[PDB]
């Protein structure tokens, strides 16, 4: 019949602000209108490339992505970005120095 598609794809769930305590683990969430399989996804936290790494394990679930961050530091805190097949997002990361008499 008729092959082809006009509908486009975009980010329906733009990143969000994530606040954590210096020395914690934060997992950002990002969903794309489509599975965006054609082209791979990238993860840039603070302003560097992490993608696949021991510390940063950017997992993938169907049409969703979960970037896990280990050993969260105050420096990294700044502005997160997520690019994919061209698209791009932005967010803010907060890291408050540890507190409390307790130890860990």
SS (HEC) of 50-74: CCECCCCEEEEECCEEEEEECCCCC
Residue 23 has a CB neighbour count (10 Å cut-off) of: 14
58 near 43, Cβ under 8 Å?
yes
Q: Where in the sequence is the domain holding 72, given as residue range(s)?
A: 1-104
Q: Which residues of 64-83 are buried (b: 16+ CB within 10 A; e: fewer)?
A: ebebebeebeeeebeebebe
Rg from Cα positions in the chain: 16
Output the six-digit token pair for 103. 């130890």
Element (H, E) at 21: strand 18-21
In the DSSP assignment, the letter for residue 93 is E
Q: Are 98 and 24 in contact (CB under 8 A)?
A: no
| Method of structure determination | NMR
Give 41's DSSP letter: B
β-partners of residue 26 are: 69
State whether the Cα torsion 46-50-54-59 is positive or negative: positive
Domain containing 18 — which CATH number? 2.60.40.10
Report the number of distinct structural domains present in the chain. Answer: 1
Retrieve residue 61's tokens: 């679930």
């Amino acid at each position: 019949g008729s092959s082809g598609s006009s509908g486009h794809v975009g980010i329906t769930k733009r990143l969000k602000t994530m606040e954590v305590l210096e020395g914690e683990s934060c997992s950002f969430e990002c969903v794309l209108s489509h599975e965006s399989a054609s082209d791979p996804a990238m993860w840039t936290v603070g302003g560097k490339t992490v993608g696949s790494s021991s510390r940063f394990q950017a997992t993938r679930q169907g049409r969703k992505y979960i970037l896990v961050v280990r050993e969260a530091a105050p420096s990294d805190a700044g502005e997160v970005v997520f690019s994919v097949r061209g698209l791009t997002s932005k967010a803010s990361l907060i890291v408050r120095e540890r507190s409390g008499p307790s130890s860990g």
